[PDB]
Amino acid sequence: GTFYDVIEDYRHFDFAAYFAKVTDSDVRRILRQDRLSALDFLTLLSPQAEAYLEEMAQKAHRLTVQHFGRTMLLYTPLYLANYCVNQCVYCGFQLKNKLERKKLTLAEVEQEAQLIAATGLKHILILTGESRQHSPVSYIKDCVNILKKYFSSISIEIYPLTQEEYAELIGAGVDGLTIYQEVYNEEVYAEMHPAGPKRNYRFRLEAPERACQAGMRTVNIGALLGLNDWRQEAFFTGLHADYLQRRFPDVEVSISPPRMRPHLGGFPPRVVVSDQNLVQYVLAFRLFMPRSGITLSTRENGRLRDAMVRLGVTKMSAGSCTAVGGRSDQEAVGQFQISDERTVAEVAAMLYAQGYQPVYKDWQAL
Ligand SMILES: C[C@H]1O[C@@H](n2cnc3c(N)ncnc32)[C@H](O)[C@@H]1O
Ligand SMILES: N[C@@H](Cc1ccc(O)cc1)C(=O)O
Ligand code: MET
Ligand code: SF4
Ligand SMILES: [Br-]
Ligand SMILES: [Br-]
Ligand SMILES: [Br-]
Ligand SMILES: [Br-]
Ligand SMILES: [Br-]
Ligand SMILES: [K+]
């Protein structure tokens, strides 16, 4: 009884045959409905629905304001360590790449925490590579103990854990989990993850459930856009979010639509995803799950992020750095290349000028 059962059930679902049946009347009908099914969400991801993106954006904006107000939660990532045993083809930290492997000392964690907290942020997301030798759970726990002096919400985006390990970290102060399945098609997942513990598709797929079972307050998921058939991968992300929300009615479920960016190693995206595709996904997902967060990172350029402020995004990073210690070492190599280099203050000033209140604690979004 896990999401894997749903993946198994859709193994023979014929996406092309479904899209072939969609008509404009279907899209107009869905825009009149209060509740959407998962296949109504698939219809809003169809080529035919590209003719209705304005109507979708009008309603998506209304729904977002209804549930979140004219607010935007700000946060930033903190990469603690970049040791990794996995060979993910698309990642700057994959094992076969040559870079300075680094783990922050606890005093470096504290100093970077102070630097970030000095901008006003209260939500932090901490990341590591998969290395139980260099960045074990006990080290992550020690970092959480320091960070809780500065941040009221600490989320983890680390290697997948057991339920008991999630419970341990929640007991130390972790509030939220972000974990991207990367690709929901099992065959393509095996192709993208040729070596390491991350080759275990099902263990990763079930990680959000294990964390929710352990009591995680918030969970943020997402496919990595660029690895596989984008409409199917967007569909499965939404299907997964809906599954989690139904299995755990009191967890706050969110999605991210991260697009592949340049990175050390140079693997090019297996599939191309346009700006309009990204917008269609965000709009369709907002209409499918009106109360779910949508997180937009600095992978997107500033002009597109500015345009998406009113289109369903509820959480934005700012002042990001994808390299371990890169906030004080401009030559440090990041996991991938960011696009929007604006600081926290610059993103907050942009939001105020759009009539949106930047907020620093998630409970202020209503
Ligand atoms: C932390 C998250 O970053 C994403 N990730 C890994 N490599 C890249 C890349 N080249 N570009 C953009 N995002 C990436 C993965 O989805 C990973 O889970
Ligand atoms: N790549 C991670 C951490 C991150 C968050 C926001 C950024 O702007 C950059 C990196 C994520 O998207 O969850
Ligand atoms: C830094 S990538 C995100 C955390 C972990 N290495 C993963 O791939 O799940
Ligand atoms: S995505 Fe996470 S597991 Fe894969 S190489 Fe990068 S850091 Fe390692
Ligand atoms: Br029609
Ligand atoms: Br490991
Ligand atoms: Br919802
Ligand atoms: Br970089
Ligand atoms: Br900043
Ligand atoms: K030190």
Numbering used by the authors: 2 to 367
From the study:
2-iminoacetate synthase ThiH is a radical S-adenosyl-L-methionine (SAM) L-tyrosine lyase and catalyzes the L-tyrosine Cα–Cβ bond break to produce dehydroglycine and p-cresol while the radical SAM L-tryptophan lyase NosL cleaves the L-tryptophan Cα–C bond to produce 3-methylindole-2-carboxylic acid. Dehydroglycine (DHG), also termed 2-iminoacetate, is a key precursor in the bacterial biosynthesis of the thiazole ring that constitutes the core of TPP. The radical SAM domain includes residues 71 to 356 and corresponds to a full (βα)8 triose-phosphate isomerase-like fold flanked by N- and C-terminal stretches.
TcThiH was incubated with its substrate L-tyrosine, 5´-deoxyadenosine (5´-dA) and methionine as mimics of the SAM cleavage products prior to crystallization. Brownish prism-shaped crystals that diffracted to 1.27 Å resolution were obtained. Inspection of the electron density map indicates features that can be best modeled as 5´-dA, L-methionine bound to the radical SAM [Fe4S4]-cluster and L-tyrosine. The amino nitrogen atom interacts with Nη2 of the strictly conserved residue R300 and points toward the C5´-atom of 5´-dA, supporting a direct hydrogen-atom abstraction from that position by the 5´-dA• species. The carboxyl moiety is sandwiched between the strictly conserved residue R300 Nη1- and E158 Oε1-atoms. These unexpected interactions suggest an unusual protonation state to avoid electrostatic repulsions between the amino and guanidinium groups on the one hand and the two carboxyl moieties on the other hand. The phenol ring sits in a narrow hydrophobic pocket while the phenol oxygen atom establishes four polar interactions with the hydroxyl groups of the strictly conserved residues T299, S318 and S321, in addition to the main-chain nitrogen amide of residue T299, hence defining a square pyramidal geometry supporting anion-dipole interactions instead of hydrogen-bonding. We have also performed a 250-ns molecular dynamics (MD) simulation of L-Tyr bound TcThiH at the optimal bacterial growth temperature (60 °C). Both approaches show that only the phenolate-containing models were able to reproduce the phenol oxygen atom interactions with the protein observed in the crystal structure, hence supporting deprotonation of the phenol upon L-tyrosine binding. Therefore, upon binding, L-tyrosine would be fully deprotonated, likely corresponding to NH2-CH-(Ph-O−)(COO−). In addition, as predicted when we solved the L-tryptophan bound NosL structure, this new structure confirms that 5´-dA• attacks the amino group of L-tyrosine in ThiH.
